[PDB]
Amino acid sequence: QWNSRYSYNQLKNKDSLIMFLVEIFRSLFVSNCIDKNIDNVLLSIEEMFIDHYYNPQHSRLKYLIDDVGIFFTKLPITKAFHTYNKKYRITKRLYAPPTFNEVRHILNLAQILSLEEGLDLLTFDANETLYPDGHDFNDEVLASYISCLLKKMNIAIVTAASYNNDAEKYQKRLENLLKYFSKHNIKDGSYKNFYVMGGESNYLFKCNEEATLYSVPENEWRHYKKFVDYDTVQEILNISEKCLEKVIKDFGLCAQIQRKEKSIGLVPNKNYMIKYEVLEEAVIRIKKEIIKNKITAPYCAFNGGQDLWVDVGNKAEGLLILQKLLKIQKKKCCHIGDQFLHSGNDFPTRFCSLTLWVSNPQETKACLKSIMHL
Amino acid sequence: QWNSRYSYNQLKNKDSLIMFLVEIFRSLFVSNCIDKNIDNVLLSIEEMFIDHYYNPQHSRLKYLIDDVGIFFTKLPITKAFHTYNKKYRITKRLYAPPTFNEVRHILNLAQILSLEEGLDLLTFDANETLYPDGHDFNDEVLASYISCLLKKMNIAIVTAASYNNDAEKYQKRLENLLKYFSKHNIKDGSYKNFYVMGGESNYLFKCNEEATLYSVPENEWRHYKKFVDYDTVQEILNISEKCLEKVIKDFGLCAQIQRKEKSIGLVPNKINYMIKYEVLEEAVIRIKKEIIKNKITAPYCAFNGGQDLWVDVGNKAEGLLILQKLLKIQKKKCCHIGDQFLHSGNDFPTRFCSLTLWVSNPQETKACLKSIMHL
Amino acid sequence: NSDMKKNIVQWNSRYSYNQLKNKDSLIMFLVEIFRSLFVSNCIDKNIDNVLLSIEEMFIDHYYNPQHSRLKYLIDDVGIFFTKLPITKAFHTYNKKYRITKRLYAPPTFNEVRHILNLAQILSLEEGLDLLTFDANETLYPDGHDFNDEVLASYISCLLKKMNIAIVTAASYNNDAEKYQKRLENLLKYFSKHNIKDGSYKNFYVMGGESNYLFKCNEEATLYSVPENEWRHYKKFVDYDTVQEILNISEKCLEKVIKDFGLCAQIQRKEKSIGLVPNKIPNYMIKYEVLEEAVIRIKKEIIKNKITAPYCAFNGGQDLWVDVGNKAEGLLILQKLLKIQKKKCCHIGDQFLHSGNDFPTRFCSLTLWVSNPQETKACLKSIMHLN
Amino acid sequence: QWNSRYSYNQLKNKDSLIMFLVEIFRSLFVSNCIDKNIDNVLLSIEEMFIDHYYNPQHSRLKYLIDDVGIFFTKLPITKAFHTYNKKYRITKRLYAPPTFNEVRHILNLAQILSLEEGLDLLTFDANETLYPDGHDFNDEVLASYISCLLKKMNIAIVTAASYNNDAEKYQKRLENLLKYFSKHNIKDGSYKNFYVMGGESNYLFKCNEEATLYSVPENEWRHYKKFVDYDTVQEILNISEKCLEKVIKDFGLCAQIQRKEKSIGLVPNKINYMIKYEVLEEAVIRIKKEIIKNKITAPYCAFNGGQDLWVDVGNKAEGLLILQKLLKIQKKKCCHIGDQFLHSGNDFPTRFCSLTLWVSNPQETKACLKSIMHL
Ligand SMILES: O=c1[nH]cnc2c1ncn2[C@@H]1O[C@H](COP(=O)(O)O)[C@@H](O)[C@H]1O
Ligand SMILES: O=c1[nH]cnc2c1ncn2[C@@H]1O[C@H](COP(=O)(O)O)[C@@H](O)[C@H]1O
Ligand SMILES: O=c1[nH]cnc2c1ncn2[C@@H]1O[C@H](COP(=O)(O)O)[C@@H](O)[C@H]1O
Ligand SMILES: O=c1[nH]cnc2c1ncn2[C@@H]1O[C@H](COP(=O)(O)O)[C@@H](O)[C@H]1O
Ligand SMILES: [Mg+2]
Ligand SMILES: [Mg+2]
Ligand SMILES: [Mg+2]
Ligand SMILES: [Mg+2]
């Protein structure tokens, strides 16, 4: 439950864990000792993550960084640096320090090597991770990566997009993907291990034998999802719809509100861009009102791209349902997404699964390629 | 004044003038007094900007903000903040503080309202401000705004691209711009008021009357440029190329070295593979540091082009300095518009000789021209 | 916040290196605003534009301490037991020192600490009923006895109008004569000006931190209070658990002398362990090792899963832990004389984390004072209320 | 040489080089690798200290730290770290990082270990480094150190005190030290190698075989002092006096102004009523900006004492250069010990012409002299 946590310091600072490694790397780079054997510094950092893995409530990493997440695996940050260093030679610089984005690459690679025991579940944030904002799947190169990985693991698609239990509009969003599944996975027995998650934990779809997605009976997973009052989801939405009107009235912008079942959010109409900071304001506006009305149901409000949405689902709950349904632990569960800020919908997955922060679908092909290289 | 500001604080920290205003606005944000009449705070900020225009090296603003730019005009920051807030209502925010890009637009509007004495020269960075990087000018709304300004004052195009003294290749880069000039900027005497600067300050061009750009000779304006012989420019070309060859080997990049007269470059090729943004910063400082090792004082410029590196023996500030010496216009009535206003960019040296407007994409240039015409 | 068992559990376990880096989160919140106000040059003009809006959040935090904008900005705000008039506190403090005429030197942390104390004093418009004093370093130098006629005159006049107590950390088991020798000049002034009034019955002394209690006699002598009168208010602690705390602490004071080789000794008491330095033929112990050791003590106590109320603190040149804290001492006094929290104040010098008087901010108004010279300025302004 | 400027960012961080080491030591303390073999980091910092000694203008230490000074000697920062660590074990700390003041002891120890080549001139700030502010000399343990050090090198006392060229006034400050010289430093000729400087570079005294000071002839050393005429000394004295008269009114000070030939200051009334340290730091920058506004270029110094402020015609750096030219001593063989090395102190300009030990009490000076004698 991260609804209450939305500290001002938790917003202005980018990421507490990644900046923790940058500032240490900055001091190392400044001392002109970055290119020498820095395993003495990296291993002490590597040991700290281990101590946090064992005692996440009283480790020294907790005393330094107060708002750390929970580590599910032993992170070989020493091996992650050498592997990333020898490739790009980022250490060869003498005037440019390491960048936040580079340490995020090193942090992502450290969570991949920690899967030396294996990996059972792998989920993707279909939007901005597989294809740009709203575009359809057309990259045939990474479709081969997902098909080969499905033969040895479960593959799920968890996206905040909602189409209200209509397993036909999701076809056009993935038609090129299932086309590759019919050519390779249909003969194999792995096609039954591919699942599609709509809404954020409200619509689930499987995969038949003809490379098409179909709905799942509600009785097969209604018990796994902690159920929620019919009327409470309406109150959450009614609160938001009132908050967005104030936002559109408080800031004269060219957008309108869109209403759905168990999800709403404003979308700019023909489109005229809305300032990124305003959508940040609207998330904290909606959250503080949900806390005021003492609502405890799982919800989410994210600032993805140039459109704001509020779902009565949770991307972490969708990860929790599949783990409880497929009998998969958290240490053998991964997720790939882009909205990993405090106002993003992929951040809750840090509480129940390993995470990989990605900025563009190209980095996912770099992620999946390094996965099966083991 | 050689570029000696290759400091670690210059790379790590952002613009000193903008972040100075952001921190004050954040304290006005957390104090919950942002929405109330903050003119008492905004008037004192102007009081510092006025005194800095008089004593730039002894002002209280220089004591607070070091390495601060030079204000050629008195900046009306109180008006600019009022009119910006009315446009976008940034102040009504309760949980998001004023950001960096907003203050960039506020200082741009402040530097636009400062032109009460009149504008006499506009300069435009070609790539990334008039059209995307590596594109030809394809816009009719922008060319219509420029046509009206061309009758009021002189307009010039100062770019970093370089085709060796070929006016046919320059008109190809902005075809639809001369097309609009041929329809509305011929009957008036403004067609003799348009200029184009190739390289960075090495090739000068002008517009002939029959809808096509032509190249001006060298002997007419070479005396205004600083005298740098052909041997020194080639050593700058050589010590650079030796530094790039280190960068290709050091980081193993699929990058090519483009060599031309008075310019060295670093361009990749598709099998375009993207060089890492940070090795460009590292390679620029390597070339700048290597040049001053040999005690060179020739006006050069090494910059990062977002996706590539280029080192020109011309200075984008020299081009503005050349046109100021040709048209007999003081630095108070000269303005520049560019996207490379970081320490690694090439539009930054224009802070030393002209008013500067910071822009990130062509859509903001059109918004800057509309506001600059309602005067 | 919640009951005192919840706040003490977080105070001795939820510390952070970032939080311990900044002395106070609330005072630093005002320094950044005044810094930008000083940097914006607009500080010397009429800044009621900005100050009034700071009060607005201070009032909103008094009515809603858990979901206020002040709790959004500062994550670890305490709980305001009253409405702080920071606008009048700024005007009154500035009209005296005129710190706003400075052009090249911003306001400092210690100055905003003074203004915040004056704001907490002006907030006692509803009256005051209890006033407690950290004895050492606020009533007299560290380790000294009471010796200030100006301070005795202020406490005596306040004693006739309200109850007076002294919460210290010095732990003499039950020898009131040893406490009397520390304040003999204070009871001497009380004998000449307070026996005529019935105010000497309103004077109390708290030995250790909430472990021993004494009251003043009609003969100006200090006497022990019967334990059957107040032992029930204190949260009881098992004799096995207290010796568990003293032993687990005593072990680290040997490890800190082995790591750092200090010429220091370890004093062990019932419900008290100490780390004192040796004489010169007094040796000086570094301040950071003392801060380091307190974190070591606190870190080790939670590792052994002890949840009893304790207080590891830094005494400038000393390091002690006591089974009990000053917040428990205030609770017992508040339960004894039936006094609401809003009409109780406490003056001390150790208001940092790993400090002595820090738990007081959870159940009373607090004044952060550096030396007895500053203590007079607090009581002199307190007498100016009526 | 000229006295440089300052920024508000530079006034906050007392010493950039010390602060440059704390942030590195913090991340070492933060990485959990502080107590391990960190020699690889210590040797690399030395590599920058060495490369800055050989090439002070273009070094990576100059690129990282802008306001870095001139290293007259190679600084062995690695051995100074182990030596200070083995004494206090500040590295075994698990929850408190190394502090600013501990690195000061390390930088002082690193500058002491750099004197393996030898010393030729030792200089002491009399006030606050030899005795408390305004007290006569009274220590035999420190007198034995100065006496034993007067044998091997020249020792001078450079203090901002100013008694009008009469040795008796200065002697009352150094009475117990001179009586120790008669017992130990008269049988040889070591008393002839002792010097005392009244003011920053105005008054000079030598020791006599009777353990007594005498004013040296002005003709024997005044040619090294950069001449400053009566009109220029009085303009600094007046421009200062006007600043203090406003500082008294602005803050309602209970203080007075004292005027001397070549000197002026602000002292509190006798009662010794405390005067705020902040308004003292404010009066420095008030006068310093006012002096540069009137284009004054004479050597001057406005410093902030413990309980008072003073402005003197001359700086301790020029006083050192007088003695360096007097006894023909090279720069790399000079050393100085002072208490106020902040940007508003009389001992800061020493960094431009000598090595420096930064202390804060006479007990730390003994720790410096004991470590110096044990080489
Ligand atoms: O309720 C929904 N209905 C339709 N689209 C949505 C809904 N919620 C989010 N979206 C959009 O669909 C995408 C889902 O975000 P994701 O978590 O990155 O996949 C984003 O582009 C959202 O703006
Ligand atoms: O000398 C040149 N020859 C060819 N291309 C260049 C040359 N110099 C710069 N460029 C490229 O053209 C762009 C023009 O930059 P701009 O016009 O300053 O925005 C640069 O960013 C480079 O990509
Ligand atoms: O339990 C104890 N018994 C005796 N002396 C103590 C004890 N605890 C702390 N001290 C010392 O007595 C001082 C009194 O602390 P204070 O009165 O809380 O300021 C401390 O700063 C320590 O030097
Ligand atoms: O010119 C002066 N005449 C008399 N006393 C002075 C003069 N200048 C400074 N002082 C005092 O002597 C002290 C010398 O400090 P020092 O610079 O550390 O030697 C100052 O802090 C003042 O108290
Ligand atoms: Mg996404
Ligand atoms: Mg550009
Ligand atoms: Mg105390
Ligand atoms: Mg001194």
Author numbering:
A (entry chain A): 46 to 315, 327 to 430
B (entry chain B), D (entry chain D): 46 to 316, 327 to 430
C (entry chain C): 37 to 317, 327 to 431
Q: Which sentences from the paper describe this structure?
A:
Maintaining the optimal nucleotide balance required for normal cell proliferation is controlled by 5′-nucleotidases amongst other processes. These enzymes catalyze the dephosphorylation of ribo- and deoxyribonucleoside monophosphates to their corresponding nucleosides, and also exhibit, in certain cases phosphotransferase activity. All structures adopt a tetrameric assembly displaying a cross-like shape, in agreement with the quaternary solution structure. Each subunit consists of four domains: an “N-Terminal Regulatory Domain” (NTRD, M1 to K59), an “OD” (D60 to T143), a HAD-like Catalytic Domain (CD, F144 to K270 and K371 to Q444) and a C2 cap domain13 (K271 to N370).
Deletion of the 30 N-terminal residues (PfISN1-∆N30) leads to a threefold increased activity at both pH 8 and pH 5. This deletion mutant at pH 8 shows twofold increase in kcat(app) with a similar fold lowering of Km(app) value. The structure of PfISN1D172N-∆N30 co-crystallized with IMP (PfISN1D172N-∆N30-IMP) is similar to the PfISN1D172N-IMP structure (RMSD = 0.46 Å), confirming that only residues 30–59 are mandatory for stabilizing SegmentD394-F407 in conformation. As concerns the IMP-binding stoichiometry, we observed that in the PfISN1D172N-IMP structure, each subunit binds one IMP-Mg2+, a feature also observed in the PfISN1D172N-ΔN30-IMP structure. We also showed that whereas residues 30–59 are directly involved in the catalytic mechanism, residues 1–29 rather contribute to a global stabilization of the structure during conformational changes associated with catalytic function. The crystal structures confirm that the IMP-Mg2+ substrate is mainly coordinated by conserved residues from the four HAD motifs, and by W365, which is situated on β-strand I. The base moiety of the nucleotide is stabilized by a π-stacking interaction with W365 and by three hydrogen bonds with A205 (Motif II), S207 and D367. Hydroxyl groups 2′ and 3′ of the sugar moiety form hydrogen bonds with D363 and D178, respectively, whereas the phosphate moiety of the nucleotide forms hydrogen bonds with D170 (Motif I), T204 and A205 (Motif II), K371 (Motif III), and N401 (Motif IV). Mg2+ is coordinated by the phosphate moiety, side chains of D170 (Motif I), D394 and Q395 (Motif IV), and the main chain carbonyl of D/N172.
